[PDB]
Structure formats: C-alpha cells, structure tokens
Amino acid sequence: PDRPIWFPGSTPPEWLDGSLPGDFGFDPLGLSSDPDSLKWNVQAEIVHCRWAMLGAAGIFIPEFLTKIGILNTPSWYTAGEQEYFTDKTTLFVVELILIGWAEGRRWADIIKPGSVNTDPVFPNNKLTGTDVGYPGGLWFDPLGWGSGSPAKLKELRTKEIKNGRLAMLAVMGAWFQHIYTGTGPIDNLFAHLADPGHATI
Amino acid sequence: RPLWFASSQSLSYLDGSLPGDYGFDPLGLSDPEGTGGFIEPRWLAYGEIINGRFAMLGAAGAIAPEILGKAGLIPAETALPWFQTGVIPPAGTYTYWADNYTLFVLEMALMGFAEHRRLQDWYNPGSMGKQYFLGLEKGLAGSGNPAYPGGPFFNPLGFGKDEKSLKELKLKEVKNGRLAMLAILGYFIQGLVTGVGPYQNLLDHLADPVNNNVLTSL
Amino acid sequence: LVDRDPIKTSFEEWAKPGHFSRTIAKGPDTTTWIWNLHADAHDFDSHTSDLEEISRKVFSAHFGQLSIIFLWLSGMYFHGARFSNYEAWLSDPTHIGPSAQVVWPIVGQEILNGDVGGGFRGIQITSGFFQIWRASGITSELQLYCTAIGALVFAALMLFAGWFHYHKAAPKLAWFQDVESMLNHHLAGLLGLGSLSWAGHQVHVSLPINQFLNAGVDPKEIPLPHEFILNRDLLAQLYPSFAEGATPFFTLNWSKYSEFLTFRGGLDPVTGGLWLTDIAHHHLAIAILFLIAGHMYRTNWGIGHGIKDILEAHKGPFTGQGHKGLYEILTTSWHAQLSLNLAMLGSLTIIVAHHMYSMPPYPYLATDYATQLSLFTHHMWIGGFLIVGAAAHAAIFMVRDYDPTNRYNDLLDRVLRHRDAIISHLNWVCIFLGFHSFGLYIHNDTMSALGRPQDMFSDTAIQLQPVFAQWIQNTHALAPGVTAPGETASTSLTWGGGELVAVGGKVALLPIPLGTADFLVHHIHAFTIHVTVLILLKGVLFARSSRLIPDKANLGFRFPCDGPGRGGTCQVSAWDHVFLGLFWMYNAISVVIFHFSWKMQSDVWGSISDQGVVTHITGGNFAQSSITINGWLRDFLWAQASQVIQSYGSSLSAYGLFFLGAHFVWAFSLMFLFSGRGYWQELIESIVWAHNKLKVAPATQPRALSIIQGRAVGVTHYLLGGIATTWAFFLARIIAV
Amino acid sequence: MRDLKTYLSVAPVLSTLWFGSLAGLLIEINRLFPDALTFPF
C-alpha cells in the first residue's frame, strides 16, 4: 500500500494491490479489472518479456561485434533474405511443428495448473515449479535458483520483469530506427555520440 | 479600503481577504454562484499569481540583453531583440549549441516534471513530501497554501517572518506582477506595429517625442 | 452556473439496453421490444420530467452533430486533394467535367470510371465544390490537405466538448433560460463577426488571386496569398487605393475604396458569375448591420429591451390580452422552439434555392447545368422536410406542454375557439383552387382530343396572361437610373433587360418570359401548398379534442385509432396528419422541380453560335406542349427518359440501375400501406407452427409490426423510392446533354 | 472490462463484424478467381 507509484500523489487502481512482482499501479484504461484478464495479461507479459530479451540480445550483440570488425554478419533487418540450406517455408513449417508442441503444453498449464508436470515417456522425470509461468525442474532451472523465501523470489521476479520491459522498448526502438534512418542501430549510437546536439531525429 | 470600478454584485464576494483586492470585477467572473470547471475563485487567484510571476521573469528577460548591447558590454551577435533570438525563426534565428527543436524537448521534459509536481500538490495538499524523490522530498512538503509554499527551498532567506510584513510583501508581489503583465502585452503589440525592439522604441520616443509617437507609428 | 461531475463515465449502461426507460429495461419478451428500443431513443422528455436534465442532454447532442458535420467536411476536402482532377480543371473549366471519386476494379465496376478530361478517370460530381474552392483563391492540393487536417482537428475538439459539458461541467437551468444574452451573442458575434471575417478574407485573398486568374495567368505562376499581405506593393499595383492604407476609412473618405467595393450588379462576362467586389461590399455591410443589431436586448448593464415587456404591450380590441404570457411558454418548452425554428429554416432553404439560380454567385456555375439543377432540387427537398417537421413538433407541444392553469395565453386560446371557421374556409379555398387549376388542364386535353384547338386556354386561342408578374419584371428591369440610381445594371438578368451573357459557347442567363403556361403552373403550385397547409393545420388544431372524440388528449400524441365505434376512428391522432401531409409535400415538390427542369431546358439553357443565334436544349416547346397532361407525359417524361434507359454499357449505367431499384423500392411500399396487421399476425401463427415441429422456435416470440410502425415503414419506403427515381432520372438526363 | 465485453456480444455489433468479415472473404475470393460461371473441377 506504501509502494512507490508511477504517478506520485495519485491513487492506484483497486485490483492492483501490490501482490505481483513489478507492480507500480499503472493501469489507466483498466484492461485487467477482472481476475481472469489479470492472469491472462500476466502470462502474456512474462512471455513477451522472455522473447524480447532473447531478441534484443540477438539484435544488438551481433551487430556491435560486426562494427568493431571481429565478425562479418549481415544486417538483422535483411537477415531473412539470405539463402540457406533449404527454402524458407520448410523451415517455417518445422518451426511451427516444434513450437506448437512446446507452446501447446504451456496452454494446458494456464487452463488447468499442474496437469502437464510429468514426462509422457519416462515418468521418473518431473517439473517442480508450483507457480504458473515459473516451471522450474532440471530443464528450466538446472542451478536451483528459482525457489527460496518470498523475499528472494519477489526480488528475482521483479528483476526479470524490469529487464524484459526495457528489452521490449529497445527492440521496438531498433526496428523504427532502421525503418527511418536506414542504417544499423550501432551506427546510430556512434552518430549520436559524435554530435549529440544535432545527431537527432 | 480604496475601491476601483466596484459594483454591487462584485462587492458581495470581494471582501478584502485576497491580497491586492480593490473590488474590480465588472464581468463577475469570480462570482461564487455555481463555481465549476476552471471558472472558480481559488483557481483564478492562483492563475493570476502564477501568470504574474512568469511575466515578471519574462519582462526583464526580454529587455536585459538588448540594453547591454547598446551599452557595449556583451557581443553584438548576442544583443538581439526578443523576437529574433530563435522564438520565431521566420523573423530570425540564432545558432545555439543544439538545434531549436532539440532544446524544446529537454525544456518540455524538465518543465513537465516541475509543473506536474506542482499540480499534484495542488490536488492533494502535502502529497509531494511522501514518496522518495532523491531525498529531496523532505523540503518539498509545501505549506497548505498552494500559491505560497515556503520552506527551505522556496523561502531560503526566511523573509516575511511577521504576518503583517508577509501581507505587505504579498501585496507588493501582486502589484508588480500586474505591472509586468501589462508590460508584456506592451512588448507584444509594440513589436507587432513598429517591427523593432522595445528598448529602441524607448530611445526613439526619447529622441523626439512628437515625430516618434503613436500618431506617427500607426 | 454549472455542476461538477453530475454523471459518472462508465461502460455499465452499455450492457443494459433500454436503461433510459423503465418499461424497456425489463427484457425482450417479444420482438416488439427491439422496435420500441429505437423509436424512443431520443425522446428525452419521456425519459425524465426534469427540465434541467433535458436541457443538459440536448446541449451535448449538438456537439456530436457538429463533430459529424466536421468529419463530413474533412472527407470532402480530403477527397478533392487526393482523388480529384481539380488542378487540371483549374486550367480549363469549360471543357473538363469535375470529378472527385474513383472506384476499385473488382467485379467489372471499373466501367464507372469514365473519362472526364484532364487525363483523369472517375465519377463526375455535381456538388459544386470546385467552384467554391476556385472562388476562395485555392490553387494547389496542399491547401486542401491542410483544410482537411484542420477539419479533423475541429471534429475532435467538438467531440471532446460534447463529453466535457455533460460529464464534467453541466450548465444549470438558469444558464439556458437567458434568452437575451443568447440572442445578443448569436447576432453580434456568431453572424456579424463571421461576416466581417469573411469580408476580410475576400478583400485580402480572393480578389487578387481571382483577378490574376481572370487575366489569364497560369495558376502555378500566381503569387501565394501571403505575398499580397507582406508585400503591399503588389496590392498597390493591383489596387492603387491600397497605397493610402486605412487612412480613408478613419477620415470618412470612403469613396477612395471604390476600386474593390462596387455596386455594379449583373454578371462577370469572363466567368458568368457575380462580381466579387460586390460580394465583398455586401458582406461588409451585412457585418455592420448584424453588429449593430446585437445590442438590442437588456443584460447586466440595464440598457436595452426586455422581450417580455415588448410582448406584453402588443394587444388590441380584437385580440384581448394579446401576446402576454408567450414569454413563459417559449422559455419552458423545447418543442415549440423546435417547431418555430424548423419552419423558419425550411422557408429559408426554399428562398436560398430560388435565389441561387437567378443570381449565380460562383464562377463557372451558370454554365454547369448539372450542378445548378442538383443544387435547386436538393435544397427544395430539404426545405420541404423541415417545414413538415415544424408542424409535427407543434402538434407534439399542443399534446404535451399545453397547460392553461399555469401558462395561459389569450392569443392561443382565441385560435382554439373558432377552429371550425378556419378549417372550413381552408377547405373551400382548396376545393376552389383544385377546380380552377387542374380543371383547365382537363379542358385543354378534351378540346385537343376532340379536334378543337381554338377552344383551348393557350397563347393562341384563349390567353390567361399573368399581368401582375410581368409588371414586377418591368419595374425591376427599369430600376437602375430611376429608383436605384447607384446601380449600373439590374439585380438579375431574368427581369428582362434584354442582354445575354455567354461563357464558352453556352448560355449562362437571359430574360425569362412569362405566358399562359406559367399562370397555370403557378396556380397548381398554390393549390398543392394550400392542401398541405390544410392537412398540417387541421392536425395541429384538433390534437386535444373534437366533436368525435372529446378526450383525445388522454390517448396521447401517437395512437392508431379509438376502435371501430362512432362509424370508425382510424387515423384521428396528430401523428397521422403528419403521415398524410408527407405525401402532399412530396407531390408539391415533385411538381415544382419538374416545372423548373422543363422551363430551364426549354427557355434558358442552350448553345450560342458565332452569328449570335441560340439553340435551346428542347427547342422552346414548353409554351405550347405543357398546357396539357398529354404534353407532360409525352414531351417531358417519355422524351427525356431516353438518356437513363440507354445508359447500359457506359459510365452512366449506375443511374440506369438506380432507376429500376428505386422503382422496386417505391412499389414495395404499397404492401405496407394497403394491408393491415391482423392478416400478418394470423399468417405468422402458421409459420411458427412448423418451427415448433423441428424445435427451432425462438424464445423471443415473433410479432407483427404495430399499426403505427407499418404506416411509418410504408411512408418511408414510398418517399425513398420516388425521390431516388427522380434523382437518377435527372442526373442521367442532365449529365449527357 | 466485463461490461465492454458484454457490449461486444450484442446482436448488431456481432452481426456487423460477422458480415464485414464475410464480405471481405467473398471479395477476395472473387478477386483471385474472377468470372466463375461453372465449377470446372
């Protein structure tokens, strides 16, 4: 109730009571007034965070190393135009099958929690996580850091969320910068650092 | 108390509590009957005070560089009139350390922080001294009167210790603010019709008051 | 005086249809509930009895209307910038047909993208926006794009204002009942300042650009409008009086401004429209007059008039107490004000339609025949509809808000005490006009069929000359130099001066003669208007009681009958009198537009040769052929419908399709008008039987339409079909020729 | 919002969405395969 708020001095919404990781009371439009929408939106935010962190790393770390000349990879924008060992549609279909099996089991855990925690082939093997979106076990938490006291968890889960949001913003920024300026994101940073007053939109 | 264009309607609610009150309200804009929206006595007084302070900052600023240029203290490339300093690029522009549209964003952000905090204190008195703000929330608590916050930040020298002195100083502030608003309107409409800076206008009037006058300017 | 946050902004009421009514909020037992939902949506009086709430609701909806109008204007301006040939038309107005709509090629509908000139393919428009933009000095599409953006911004502003003045700060009832201040502001500020601003725009923008265009300069070589303001030398070259500035204005040396403020009269030979200097002078004078007129009514400063005091002092030996009490009625009833304003606005629209054709105010408008015809017909129909609505809401006020115990008025009481004499006299006048107007056409038909052309009412056998209108024409033609010394030419070319204006090989305007046929058609117009006024005034005057049903006010304003007794009481309510007057309004307006079309095509419009001989479109057959019904059937409907029935396979095939579609829609309405509810309710019972057999019977029981709903559907479909048919016929006829 | 979702399930809005999607599908089908008079397969 005394947590920092996005708009100091204002009143947070009633459905945001501070129980969730990364909660600052930001919901002007009330998109999650009902509990079911709240759970669905939490799961969507967690997945979007995790994909956006993988995407930001993959966009920026390769492009930086190319500029300093260690590697010679093409631009991320046109990486889908190169010719690989097979046609792109076959790769898309293989992706669709594999990610459909992967995400399909994630759908059943949202609807009915703890029903897909067993290995279909070798029943000696299980996932250990109690919380929807935090699956645990030797596959997703091999170091065992994903469980502990509520203090240890609410920090780690808040660090994940705050990093994911920043990554999402960075990825969209890179997309729009390449659309407008027509040059890789790292060149934009060096141009800005050369003449910060004028190297601007 | 002295009165200035007072009326029976206006005197029914202007009883002299506000500083610099002379009963002048021919249109009855501050009538407490059915207050709502932005037409409200408290908001009108607050707006008058804030506009007076900003005009007082602006009135001296728009003429300070010009007089020093004619006094030979600052370089002539900086002794520009207020309308050729980058405010209106069609009238003229000066090249700063950053392009004008870039400075606008930074000004917008800083002014947004300051003005949003001021507004949120107006809405909820004493709210700005609660949440952690770099440890500066200890002195930004306000005083319960939105126009006169006081405190170690906004009242460093500790003037106005006595209440009578505070009332006199509030009256002086109101008078100077009104005079500065009048001067700013004079700035605008003098620049419109003469096409040259106000200091040069004053020097023109002093040189020959009859050939350099409104009768000869309009 | 407002209230802070009177109603919460929420989506809760969106999920409960019929929340505005107690009866409708229960739930849909039958299908009548769905129809009841839409019919009572905007009847704010039935929702609540508090006048303040009704006023607050009314104030906010006008903001939504303004937002919709601004969106429509934004679309109209945007389509001219992106999907038009305006810039090509601006270089050759007489040979290029305006177009602002294009069509996607999907099912072969790209045939509608016919040629119009200027290397453009699209649908030809007849709204006249090109001439409006040309008269404003608009040259490029950038200006139109900016105007569309501004209109979008204004629509957003109107929507926000509508939300604000209902959910955040709603004015009190005392604010609405300040009629003196509202009249003062709407006269001095809304009209006077608007006229002054438009005069300033015409002085500083329209005049120089239009002078450059008329001189023959390429539109891309004309200076921009702001260059005339920053560079006074250019305006001085165009108008030397601008070198003196505003000094002549303040020294009362107004004669120096005679270069751009004239009183010429007539038409501009180059463009065929009114002189723009005359328009600027007109707007200046009108602005002055409206600014002075806005200082009449009293306000907080004691000087001015009190409307109640003016009303109370007008009484006579024939009227008793006079206008005393009318001030309280017009400040507490929304319906009476609506009726009065509707009547005045409809009359004004008809006056505007009549005036714009004889004094063409836009360049290259007189020689664009399709635009003229379309504008005339459009504004005539709008005026008729508004006039009918006036009577409808007058009847509503009489039924609901009439209360002599607290709102007594002597003038209204005296009218209700002799209504029989009024209705009987109007009945006799209608019968006399019908006998002596339409009967002369039947006499002509019989005499022509019998082989006796020397016994007809015509210009060759028995003349019926309209000598009163000819005297007015002669008086107006000789006004300059006798009764209007300051004028150079007459107000209009139609008065009969004898001069002809031709633009690009076509006739713009010329004197219009009057003869025997005009007499007959004018008396036909008078007859139709009188009958419509009879049906509407009978409906208003007998709304509360009659000799047949003494208690008619207890049954309401909109009820079907009072049963089969008293010999039968179908159609006794005041709603049925509007339902019956719509049909007569349609009849009258159709006759008027047919008269206009035939007269224009026969006596005015045509082409002019090098030697100066005029060939009209139909060759002047109106005088001898329109004096019989067979003439109207043969030389107008049969001959001029060949364009619309031969339009298949060309860019005008849409009009041909709409002709048949509107025929079908018109004929479809007769099912609802000639039949009654009981048959259809009995028929549905058999259809429901087989749905029960297959377990597909709905839980919302199907019901036949009510008696009033059936009447309304019939009249709506009847009007839509007829008007659409005439629209397609007119457009297909006039675009081709 | 539950009330907003309820308003989206009312008959006119749902019918409008369904018919708009249907018209779009039919227009694209006739755009890909124009002038079909017989079923040739």
Ligand code: CLA
């Ligand atoms: C400024 C003009 C104005 C205003 C504000 C009003 C306002 C009002 N009128 Mg009204 N009226 C007007 C002009 C006006 N009228 C005119 C000019 C006429 C003469 C034709 C009438 C005739 C009239 C009658 C006969 C009645 C009213 C009534 C009313 C009241 C309720 C209206 C209602 O619920 O609408 C509901 C609105 C509709 C049902 C929409 C009708 C749609 C039209 C008919 C068809 C449109 C076809 C469309 C193009 C097809 C597309 C369909 C789409 C689904 C695909 C309301 C106070 C009623 C009243 O007070 O009852 C006590 C009443 O009975 N009026």
Ligand code: CLA
């Ligand atoms: C084409 C069909 C038609 C005709 C001829 C009429 C005719 C008439 N309607 Mg009418 N009406 C019609 C369709 C028609 N209506 C339709 C479709 C509706 C919609 C429901 C209405 C709705 C309507 C209303 C609501 C009212 C009328 C009224 C009237 C009368 C107006 C007063 C008058 O004397 O007119 C002039 C009369 C004529 C032109 C008919 C005479 C025809 C010529 C002169 C032949 C004369 C022959 C001569 C006497 C010798 C014959 C002798 C014999 C042995 C051969 C008039 C009789 C009003 C009324 O009752 O009177 C005020 C009235 O209030 N009508």
Ligand code: CLA
């Ligand atoms: C699922 C709905 C449904 C079903 C199964 C039927 C079935 C039938 N109707 Mg029928 N009808 C319906 C809706 C339906 N109707 C509606 C909504 C109307 C009002 C327009 C009618 C009006 C109607 C008439 C007037 C007649 C029938 C008749 C018949 C029978 C003859 C077969 C036929 O196609 O007639 C033709 C049926 C039609 C042309 C109806 C139009 C089809 C509508 C648009 C379908 C609507 C479906 C609905 C929206 C379902 C939504 C599903 C969603 C909630 C999941 C048959 C048993 C005939 C009969 O045997 O008499 C007893 C007959 O004369 N119907």
Ligand SMILES: CC(/C=C/C=C(C)/C=C/[C@@]12O[C@]1(C)C[C@@H](O)CC2(C)C)=C\C=C\C=C(C)\C=C\C=C(C)\C=C\[C@@]12O[C@]1(C)C[C@@H](O)CC2(C)C
């Ligand atoms: C969602 C998003 C934006 C979010 C929007 C916000 C803040 C909305 C906020 C609000 O709702 C709240 C909170 C509360 C409401 O009351 C109000 C609003 C204001 C409405 C951005 C990104 C969302 C999603 C992202 C970032 C997607 C990532 C993409 C990836 C992984 C790309 C990977 C690749 O780049 C590689 C690695 C290599 C390349 O070669 C190939 C590709 C495939 C291109």
Ligand code: SF4
């Ligand atoms: S039900 Fe029909 S026929 Fe019978 S009295 Fe009523 S309106 Fe007349």
